[model samples]
Target chain A: QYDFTHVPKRQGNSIKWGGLKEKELPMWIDEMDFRIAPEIMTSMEEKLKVAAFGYESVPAEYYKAVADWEIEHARPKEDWCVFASGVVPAISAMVRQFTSPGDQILVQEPVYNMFYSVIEGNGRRVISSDLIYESKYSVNWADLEEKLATPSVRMMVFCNPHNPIGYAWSEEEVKRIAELCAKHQVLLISDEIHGDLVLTDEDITPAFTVDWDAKNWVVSLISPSKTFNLAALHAACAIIPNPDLRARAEESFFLAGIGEPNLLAIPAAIAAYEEGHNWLRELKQVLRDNFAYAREFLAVPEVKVLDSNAYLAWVDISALGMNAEDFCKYLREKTGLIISAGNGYRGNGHEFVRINLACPKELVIDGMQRLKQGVLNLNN
Target chain B: MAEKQYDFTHVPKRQGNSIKWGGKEKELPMWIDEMDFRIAPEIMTSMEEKLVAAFGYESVPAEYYKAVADWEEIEHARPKEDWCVFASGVVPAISAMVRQFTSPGDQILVQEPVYNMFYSVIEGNGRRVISSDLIYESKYSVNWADLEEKLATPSVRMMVFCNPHNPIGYAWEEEVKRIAELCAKHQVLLISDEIHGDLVLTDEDITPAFTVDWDAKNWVVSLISPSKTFNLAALHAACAIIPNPDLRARAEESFFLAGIGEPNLLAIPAAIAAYEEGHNWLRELKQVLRDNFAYAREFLAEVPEVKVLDSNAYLAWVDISALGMNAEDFCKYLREKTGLIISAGNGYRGNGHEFVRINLACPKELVIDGMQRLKQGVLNLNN
Candidate 1:
């Protein structure tokens, strides 16, 4: 068991927690409740020592670092990787760049909530591919393929290792989706931010390895933020291997004015990828331990933990005969344990709640205890 | 005068520079040339320090507001109330302003040989581009008569102004007053980009947009950023100083839709350090730029075929008409022959047959060496 005695205080250290009132535990945002890797911190210190904060252009080294990371981990080096301030900006740019105003894009339901805002915010339409939750967690691929074949669907934003549900797609599943996209001539945007963090039991592969010709139709969005806890630094890369697809993606980036990474984000990313592997291994171990603890301690009759391959646990609180939002409110108000409401992810998420296990194991235990007491109080 | 030590090797490599046709090699990348010097120690330190406080939502402090206000007061002699902040680079802010102030299909006037993005911003947004070409004598200056005629068009709602203009840096005098009066008469909103105001190689500082007392109908939106001065384009923080409350409200609403507000918290503090404390360093830096410009003129005298721009900014806008090739072909030739990458004039919407902008913002040694490379490249060319 990892020792929690010397764990740094997160109450004042976290933005999501500190930005709120002293009593409010911030479990709403998806950021991990842990300190960043030492390498990232060290890199930041080195950068600060430079003493100039003038305007910075995204250095060629920055692109090289991303390209090298993609080549080393994912696939081909020919793929053009463009950097963005964040994934939201990238999604927004893609909405503006690929489709005409008011065109339709496909989104899997109970996915990342921002996908809806990014699509509709840019005057585009979002067609939902409601995931068939087998045993209330695993994705039903047939429904996804049916949605992809729609005539009006110009693009598909695939959330790999899907958020809220935490179902990491197998190699076959990814290949099948890529084949459907290629056959239909529909552009596939695989948001693989969570691709790097595969829990012990989860089967995860680089989405790029699915098909050779997939580059022609695919643009994969990945970042070190989820893996290294660097969201505030706001650095993300869009990897497009095909020249034609890259040109198209770049045009979108140019239009949105997001073709550059913040200066410090570049160094921090380099450190995370190059030097933070050991730290990441430790983090994944902690997450795995927390998952096991939650399963053993909080597996009550009223609540069920769904199959999760990522750092999050999708809980079916519907057995309590209460909506996920109400259940979340009960957890927050009665027990001071804040977790994400299911409705925030999508309509399909209404019966579920997402509990982040990416925190210290001690907090995970505390949160689970609070949840147990709160559910009993509801029963009383 | 104390000589400041500058390491040209520390100059960050710009990936966007690779987008230029001939910018792919190890040649002297004088094209799209930003300064080759490392950023000020204070600016770098400030940004680095902020990087450590990672994973937090950013809020621009009141001191950031004061820093910009103080900069305008000291440099441009403009007051604080006249400025408003936007969380984007200048090019994006220009596009946003175009989207906000003008309707689709409306004409926006811009001077030819202006920053190329002004043309792209206008045409890319589906707005009509009305060009009032700069009057080029020994030096380039605004053709006020042509500007007035263009502004008189009822279809024109905005005019993008590049003061201490790019390519040919002509710092506007009372010509700004005349343009302001003309804009007031024509009801044109002047979107003045003063990004290069700090880098004026000349003795006189350029006038700020708020100095021009145009009528309330003619709103002036001055776009400024540390990108040009400090080479921090990636940070993406720019301020649009809009004096009119109604126009400011409209711009803010557009910013909300554009989702560009919330300045990168680190960028704000870095900018504060630059504007508040780095003026002495900037003045010295400009002197080095002036030396480089002078050196370029003297070196080009050896090859009488190239006609260089007179003054201000680090760009050397050279007329290469005697080379008997288009700017694109010429730039390719230079890159192939000498590996000296310079920006093509075609991108600037200038007379594409003869012009290219060479970035002169580098260490004197690199500039001198680049000149030698240019001479060798030109001498080998068969006219």
Candidate 2:
């Protein structure tokens, strides 16, 4: 139903592709190869008509778009959004605002790599509860609860529909995590950047939507950056429902000078949300197609892709008796396929490799061909 | 000569949180630091190209650094390419440097009757501001002995300097050199806001503190931006030149931590174009501004109640004290009576109650429109 044939022009000035070697095809970074929806470009063009750039305020329309978009999944009661420049920037600011220098930030690994920097950059400690990987990846509840209950653990960075390994948690799982964190009085920070990209079902409960009382602190961070292929747009919102927590989170975002969006961010974000319904539906279908093709094409007994709801395929490359990083290196050397090795994601990640499947179908096929050839070369 | 005449006459209806234009709808806003002029055509051309590129994450282009270095090298006879660092905005950079270089409760100094935001940047970051008030005997100049006494305080760690000064536009080259010597002696850091340096409406060239010959060159950071010059406020781009490698590194770290140094997708190309081909256009703009200044200055000089300072900045700092009214009250009354918007000078802190700043960056017609409104308001007060 959607055109996933033509690739976006991203070679020369693009950070994702520009830095790669001429022969290498990059499928590593979270940045997408698909061009942004036409609605976004049209709205941005409308913004340019205003001409002279001046200081701007976040208009009512911007907040309404955010609030309206969330009603589909989680309704953050009472205009409790702290708009920020980006998600990582907000996380970094929250670290500074919520914790002292020696405080601990708990996370589930292998997790998004940027979480480590946001924690350490603010002089906080990163304590990870490694997800158990016994054939299939699953959380060890005992390990998570232990980390959450620690006196020194000030915050928890929960990647909802976890990245690198696209594990979509059920609402029951989300509520349990929230309840446990509340019992321990730890602030649970849920990074839901991929909430809109779940390939199968919309079951990943947003942290703000999880039922909890005053004992637990929670913030759900969402952005169109990941969903819209507008990483360069630089806008995100921290949905904090609790009144006191919202004010504090806003203080963190504002004090660090990350609260305000640029002129284009307003229209670009507002239009993407208010008008980008059809495009998102088609995009998910396209993601599903890529997911289907990969599973069918790589049906070898030795190596395989674990099922995922997210746009990425977290392949279990350990079946080939290969370390994820070394396997990725071999593929890069032989077939010029650049995929993310699990080493960057920390524990249990050494067994997996992440392949970005958000490109045109033709390019996805090309990448799979290279992967197939590399695996065959190893076999021979 | 460029065949297409760039229009400085068209005042595009701007709407936002513009302090200049946000008052009464009928107000002729000749007050805020921004101009009524459209941006340079070439700069806008670059911005359009970037917009069509459908922004993805980008690296800092090498040409951006080259163009900026070329600008400083040609315009000011100084600044090496390595000395320049990209920051978000001049004031944001100043705010970062304040938090980065000094501790809370430490004293930061700025000359009074200077740019008012310097006070907020210091105080907002939990630092105390101590002013060495610029004396207004015949014209605005430093009270050097008093300023020197203030700087000698052990707690005074930095000074936020306004170069080619705002409100009362006077570029202090020799005074700057002398002050750098004092800061060096006192171990005080010098943070110069050269946002208005390129907008000098006179013959006096702005002496960027980094360009000043001093043994304390390493103690200085000059914040330069196209925001004031190109009216690119929303563009949010600036360059900071720190000669010392160590101070530069600290400044870089501070900017990143503060979340204000990332260049917008289009800011880089727009800035590069402005600095590269903007000279002749700037010349024309400056000449028109000087002509606008002459009209307002001559009109106000005739009024017995007003004492107007001849400023190199594109503003007229006029004392309205002879009417027996503070500038704040006069501004409200003027807005009510004639709808003329000019800044009440009290925020600048010294002898400011007696003065109002009129932005002269608009066309002479609008300046005259504002001047006539001022005349009407004063007549009502006089009667």
Candidate 3:
């Protein structure tokens, strides 16, 4: 069994741990507090023995390992994949390649904060179809369709198993989104970086799994960085089912200077996909336990723990009568428990705070206590 | 009170994913710039220590910048830490800068028979290449008037200067200063590739374009990396030294948008270790390289038709024009008859048709074997 109790002493410039103040715990940034799976480390160590670092070409075994991980009902064919530096880089390049400057890129509001930057950062416009929030977030199909049908909207970045509010779209919902995009001649980019981290038994739909052969509009960007806590590995793959689309995507990545892998990228990714199943299984259980503990401890009139399919816990704080930013500031100043204010994610985020629950259970419980006390102290 | 003497004698044989060693079973591949030596032990240990911790999102640390600055100060002219921008590699930085600084259909200048990839990066990004070809009279020198003429062209917005020029290694500091002055006169941005600055096998050292000062020194961007010095190309780490804050900011933004700015996990630690501890290892490597070149030049003397240019870098620029054959044909014949794979210099352009470049980075035994193979192949071609 993998040990999830000890938080290894991090070295170097870790944005999560190094940037923290005294006594502050980082329950923000999607990076996990757990040490990486030992198997991945072993694989990389084996590569270090190779010693001579020179130009490298990704081997067929890497592609095969990616195919074998098959986290969703849909699987990527070995030939359909193109290597890239990371999902964000791939998405950024695809945006530059698929859309022109000043073109509109559609996304669900209150999604990943990076979505806004990579889009507008490259001169593309962001037009959001805000998800409807009641007890849980739901898609407004009509709004999504209308936005896709916009004359200038050429792409839609679908965050399947969406970030911030970790809602894993059902198979039918994913299929419908792809079909609608195909109908409107819009390219659909599904960021499935978190598809492998689904804690629930419910299936996460992969965009490449959708049965749309009419056009090659869907590109599913997947990586093990989130699953295996290998963000520094800087590896990801773009699954384009159609050969023509795959070629263009590969060219775009190459032109962006991200097509080549670092020395450890291929080996670490291959190990994570091929040997990381049991570790992931244990990791998910730990995350599920942490989520359960937070939900039970914070079960109050002021906060509601929304169902999250990933490691992040999305909490509703509207009854607290303060915006998420003010509440986060109070929590940090008082208890030194750092968490993310969801306002940067855009819609309905002002009243919501997202807590990363990938740490040990003890830290999770401590974070839960800080949350309650921060609320009580604010009300005082 | 002693330092470790690194081993260049017994190095590891290359295994996976090498373009240099990826050849026919009998082929002696002395083509690409990669070495057949093990990495420095201290650097490897530093990386191994880093591997013990979890891999996660990381920022390039100040230590990395300080290490680079210190290395530059000790080895060449120093620049401020703030001026250094981390890029994945020199080639990637060049490609990104081309796209960021120049518009489509604009022209970029280069010296001929330079690193061949300069042309690819420019043309691939929809920019044109205009060369002020280096003249090879006994040794390579720049045509100052022609260089100024090309720089004056209104469309030529940038020039990629290969300091201590590749294919034929000649690091003329006066020529470097003159070119920078000309580029400044024409208001053209000067980007210098000094990746080979640390590999000077001769007494004359390389002049980093950053050291050349003028009123318009801000227009110059000097790119350097430990890849060539420490054999860390696959590690994909390099830094661009830009003096002008405005140009540095734009270059940083350019690298970010092109997705080539971020470093991998090993990039930082390995680079830090190399710059801080690689001084001894680099000194040993230059000695080994000098020996290899000496053996090669002496052994190939029997072939009177071939004249090897005295190069300061590890590459041997052999002129095969005495045989009345083009480089491509000679390369093909050599490979076919001898299985000794080397680079045809024609790809580097401008009178390169009569030249071939052999990499002398391997052990002396391998170099001797390669020279013998070349001799046999040449004899067979004549027969």
Candidate 4:
């Protein structure tokens, strides 16, 4: 039913592929090189057949499908979901709504780079409780609490199945962080975009399902964007259990004018959540194989690939004796392979680089070969 | 190599997809500007072709800007490709621009009897709305004296002008330049909404704000979209053309912060198809709209209590004051009594009390049916 062996070239102008010059393989952006799920495509095609693209209210089935998908996490009530065009827009709206200018927003850095952009771009300051990375990354609880205790720190953006580092916080960690933010009256906005993309055996715990009393303080923004390669779909659902927070969040989204869905946003999302399970199972297997091949090939003395949960591999390249930016620059210039420099993600990101292994195995092999040659040449 | 004949006869089944179509059973919805017709086939083809690729983060292609520039050269001011910025929609850009250009408690001016969202976007952003109501003696025209006074106020930092004004369907010509000059003189930002410029049912086209003189162009920002023209409001795509470097940068900054800077998956492809290949389809669409309006006017003429106001856009602004009832009550009675839905002009807020706006962008059959229903409602009220 699903094909993953052959890599299909993007027929349109895709930023992940077309963004690079000729002979450069792009493994930086998170979009997959495989074809989209046929089921999702079918649903969108049926919607296109309607031919009448007018203003629309989010259909009830959209929320129902969203709730049903995350049933492992105490199944959020259907009404608790609010439709936003994208998770990034929803996060920016929440920051603008809940906090004032000059307020500090807490984050676990080196997080997804966009978190910093949304916070500081909105005139709010970013305060980070840097995750401690020994062999694996874990939260610095004391540091997190201290920042949360700061009177001016009004919000915290928590990335679960965390980006760049790709560590899925355990259920207990989810509860602790949720409780800590609630204790200090800080808004804990969990970006669970990568939740369903877990490559490991353990399931990522949603912050909305925390067994704590302060469900009001937690908001989990989940989207099938990363899971199903639907970034351009421009759709996400914000799960807010608390009435007051949900009301305020709805107002913010509406004021930002991102509350409504585009022509395909509703149908595409409903299809992905409803009929995308088997397709997702196949994609995960491909990602796991891609990650395993990269790990085995790059098992050199100078590099270490962390066993991360998401499709993105967090590689520690400190032994190469070059910062992430310089290393990535050398690779791009020397081997024509593009990967993300970790410095943009901040806090110890200079020691590491994040490579997207979500493409076909052949491309992943080629990328790994280019990376190895770049490493050897730089070392010499 | 042959011209494709488009279909304007079949009404689409849009209950699950359309805000306008999802209504009470058997109710004739001519209230909003959303056309009951399907989009052009070429646009649908372009969009379908785009689906062949992986849906990923996409940059606004240069082709999109070129298509927009080429299309605008036909009637309105042809903006330089560099002057264009992509936004999700016209009203979102307006809301973002309101926050970017003005401070809280600032007054934004509008010509009353305009699109109702202007007031909501202004007030919702914590700004006050000051309207210099349009004077409707024989027809709608700008109250220049009142507008100039309001524009001169230091607290008023922005003015939103609708080209081919909505609800009343009066398209601006010389008024565009004069309004831009005054706003420039008063140091107020002029945001011209030209969404309906392409939908003109008459030969005279609406002027775009960017075509004003260089000095006034520096203060002018024109918002255009395929939404209203192509009946793709749900596409969530629009373009902002700001002539001044500083103003353009500020507008771009606002759109970026609002996270509406990137185009959605189908935005560029669909827009390119519409602008490049939509000419013939639009010609046919305009013919249908013209006939629909003509039928509406001729049919309503039999009901002497109400007069169908002259309009260039695909709407009929009917003067119902002779019936001795306000527009809200009249519209309510029309919908309830005859299942005909139209816009109550009082929501437009001017001397709109004596008027109502009906969308005539549907098939001739619906236009005639709605006209009959409206006549029945008016006659019943009089009796």
Candidate 5:
């Protein structure tokens, strides 16, 4: 019963939309083009009324909402989570806290591009265990385990229900990776940001819900940003199952100046978790419809649509006969379609492009039309 | 007349996570610099409207910078928007600057009986606090020779100036300029915390460190925030004005690394309202604060053991050195005996052990009642 028709306008330094000229459509950036769910508005409205906006302390209700959302999605004890500004902030802090300078951080290439920067940005080195391309992208477990056992490799930034390619790894695959990390004493930094955005019926394995015995080496970063489209809220929780681990992480986040929540973050997150269930149900359906439509449209000889469990559509643009970077520039310049080039994600990304299917159907159709036009006219 | 007036009388619920108000129910807490007043209506209205747009990743607008620049120009003699940089808060920026500019075990200078958190912010970042204690005979003033010698110390790398100084509440511009010049002579990086710049309850206005003079001015980092002025500590917004491009670029990198630069949804809107639209509200607030201070000063005349310092800030610093007991122990006893909570001066160091600071930025009735508690507690202590 959801209407996938509203076109939300972005302006005044909206980097996604405002950075584009008048004719361009931003099918890039993970921002949603829909109005936020009403549940969020209701909770924030209640906060605005409190108007006694002095300094705030985190209430038990805020943590309770996080715990409840965790239970509904995966299995997590109420007290196992530590709050931070966002998942990225939590991961960044954990990296510095857990690893030493020049230490190696393992990542599966053809993954989220931010992983490389966050790893090296903090003076850590990135050692990639490239995902294999065998018709469908699969983990190179032999290489992964070897990389985990690599000298001085203490961390691995793993994205589940992967971004760009959008693969929801099988539970068996997830458990295996965890056990390997545990065996090698590698810290598995599981980025489950896109976990809630699985457009298909497949079960996405939350790292927190992975084998608990292997969780000592795991740091599962979770957020409601992508799920409810509230990136600006800047709230997320790091689930560390072990008490000693959770307690240590709590001190590190405080030292990192990210332990405190913003005035609206706790309340806004509470609404998204406690009351935004029906809205998310509607959002998933909307995303599924857009995904199906785009899959058909992009299934031409020039493009290969990869199996994406995400609202983002990852496609092989090999037939376009250009690197994904050049393809991105050409599509933006020629047909006013702004889509992310995949080369930055590293493994085989030079031949791929990624598009977000989380907008209204009309825009998704508009985006595909632009993509078709851009592709057909590539020779000219 | 166009600037609408607002109510500053009622005390709202401040219990749950309020650091200042988190004390026992019977305790009259005036320890932290927070006020019991509700936020200004203009800012509150602006924030409520911002919530309607919903939170999303945002880019800083030119207007946000413009609003801050305009307020800075209106408040002091400084160049406009180009020098303005947004920071999470003044203290957060200070902490980042300490870590960025100083090595571990390097000393940062401060004038004590100053803000107590200055010590924690310095020590927390693995730096040492070098105090150039202020002399308080009739009024608090810097010992220029002693300050100069402290500045000359080879290990001293930074100075956090509570410009228009806190606790003592003097807003004279001359002492600030002299201190800035001394810091410049010593090649010390000067960070002027002007969080309390607007609460000049007297006719004298605050002199921002950016106005300290041209040659030495390039080194000063003046931090301004609406938190202290509007009681918006939770809003977490501040303006960092750096005159030199190189200095700002380095500090910006440090801020980015520390993750203390992003603006929350409410902070941006609240700052604009607080600065451009908070005229009448601030005017009325200052009047109420002055009224409350004068009332407390007159009522506590019976307590001869304590001497009140003249202040431009919202709080009164009472010298209780006449009572040989430690200020902290006395206050703890006072809290237990009479539920009257005031900050012990020992936290400020120097002669602070003989004093207690009381917040007067409260309702007049509440201020009077608190004053009564202080007198009764003092008599109970003697008994």
Candidate 6:
């Protein structure tokens, strides 16, 4: 019911979207096109009024906000939450600290692209558990179990309500994965950044939803940067339930200098969790409507919508007789429509494309029309 | 010099000299000793105005460089043209300079009882560290003979100098010119970290690399930041002044993955404000810190067990050998007994068993109270 008539001009100046040509319609980078919530803006202004921008001591209020949100939303005081520069740095520190230099860490393939770099960059080997795409997307539990069973595999990074594919796992599935990891003595680093942005009927379970003792080996990362378009360098907190695991993570962060919080990030995050719910709810409605319009307008024998949650539309573009990269290139050249190619995410991504629906309705429709024209031109 | 007198109490927190610790009710965050004082009012106003601008792509303006150059001329001795901007902390900038100016596994010289992060950044990369231990003679001083011998080794490509040094607040002298001259003779790049250059307790200003004549062969990389003096650590902006073109180019390549070389849009104006308008406030703040040092020294002298370093810098490096506990164990005891958290000296590659660095850059009352509590803990150990 939210209006999406405006162009949301993100052509040349958008950090996420404007990296491409000016005329191009950016459906890339999964940031929402809507203006940030008013409460967040007001809170930032209030902080600015204080007028002393120096080294910020991550206030107790900052930690309490995260704790309160977690207690109200899902669980209670699970672990000591520590702040980091961002999720990427958090993952890098975890990889370096928990595992030996050349240790093997398993990842779910056709997954987040940064996983490859994070694991490989730390001099760790990446083992993949490719998700099976049948009528709907689902985890290959058997393959995951087999990978976890390997003695050499030290850790596995789980992407919940996953990116691009946008599949949120049920509680049973999450518990099973935790059990498997425990069986192999492997540490589990759950990335739940997209946890709050689910636009699906399925009930989502964060990795800590299960009954397994949190003190042994589990770290959960969550952030408001994705839900709100506040990604201009913000903070992220890693929830560690286990004391030993928390201590280890703290040691790693201290070593990497990620223990400190970004000053501006605190106000933004506090405002997002404290006062941003109503606006976020409206955003979800807009995304759902965009999903319906995209499904109908862009439907063709070559393109099929895969499972989606949040604002992401994972499309099987193989039917158009073009690889994901080529399809994106054609869309850019002919229609000026920019969407993320699947290969950037991981394996079998060559046959897919990810369209972000977190924009105004008009932009979504314009992107759809351009996509239609690009596919028709290919036929011509 | 005219004895400048001004009201220190009512000065705006936004102005520099705002107390760092004890401002919040929390007992102590003795780890970094960063003052809890509010920054300069001008800096705060500049930051607030910059925040209102459409949060979009903006570059670090030339004004940032000019302001830094001006500050270098006024505060430290340096010309504007000698500086290059870095949008990161001194640690990362220094680490990058090491990687760029030296070959892998090359030896980089450092003094023991140094800033701990230096060890990690140097040894973490494939470089080897040549330690010329700082001699503790009533106060810490550079062992020039050992430094010269260390530089003579052809493999030693760099020497990391921490002036008005951390933990041990010893300021290097003209006699220390021997180390700089050695670098010139050995053709080694001297990376002088003068981040604490402005913070001197004595009337004497710490000598910087550019002031020391080492001929052109001594390619010095001076790392400076507003973080320590101005309390802008979170901003993560610093500068590396490299007079040598070849070395600067190599350093730039090493920082390529570190994102673009632009003024952190907000850091520029804030830094400018600090350098230009923060002088009087800093003087008041340094006086308070000097008083805190004097109080702690007098209190600790009675114990006969606690030996404190004599110099500037907000840190009070104490030797706790009489207490039978090592630095780590003593730190735990202090934190548990009194909510006083001090940094252990082991991290600084010092004689780990006997030392802990306590930050006394707080309000006079808080510093006095902390000293009392510390005395009580020492007495308990004696019992």
Which candidate model has the greater DockQ, 1 or 3? 3
- lDDT of every model, 2 decimals: 0.73, 0.81, 0.86, 0.87, 0.80, 0.72
For B86-204, candidate 4 gives per-residue lDDT tens digits of: 99999989999998899999999998987888887888778999999888885877778999999999999999988878878888877788899999999999999989989888888
Could you tell me the TM-score of candidate 4? 0.97
Error of 3 at A160 (Å): 1.2
Query: What is the Cα-based TM-score of model 6?
Result: 0.76
| Candidate 2 chain A: 10-residue stretch with minimal lDDT | A208-217
Show model 2 residue runs off by greater than 4 Å: A1-3, A211-216, A320-327, A378-380, B1-4, B15-25, B212-214
Please report the candidate that would top DockQ against the real structure: 4
**Every model's DockQ:** 0.23, 0.45, 0.68, 0.70, 0.46, 0.13
lDDT of 2 at B28: 87
TM-score of 5: 0.92
True contacts kept of each: 0.26, 0.40, 0.74, 0.75, 0.49, 0.13
Cα displacement (angstroms), candidate 6, residue B197, comes to: 3.1
Which regions of candidate 3 deviate over 4 angstroms? A212-215, B1-4, B323-326
What lDDT tens digits, residue by residue, belong to model 3 across residues B1-383? 23438767665666466667753777898888888788898889888988845888778888888999999899867788998999998988998888788988999999898888898889877899999888888687778888888899999999998887897887767777777888888889999999998988876778888777766687899999999888787898999999889999999987877777777888989999999998888888888898898898998887988999877659899999998988898899899889999999999887899899998888778898899999998888678
How big is the positional error of residue B230 in model 3, measured in Å on the Cα after superposition? 0.4
Model number with the top lDDT: 4
Instruction: Please tell me how candidate 1 rates in CAPRI terms.
Output: incorrect
Error of 5 at B217 (Å): 2.7
lDDT of 1 by residue, A274-299 (tens): 77767777888888899999988866
Q: CA lDDT of B18 in candidate 4?
A: 68
TM-score for each of the candidates: 0.83, 0.92, 0.96, 0.97, 0.92, 0.76
How does model 2 score on DockQ? 0.45
Give the CAPRI class of candidate 2.
acceptable
Per-residue lDDT, model 6, residue A135, is 34
Which lDDT tens digits does candidate 3 get at residues A63-139? 88888887544667899888998898889889877889899999999899989989988889999999999859988
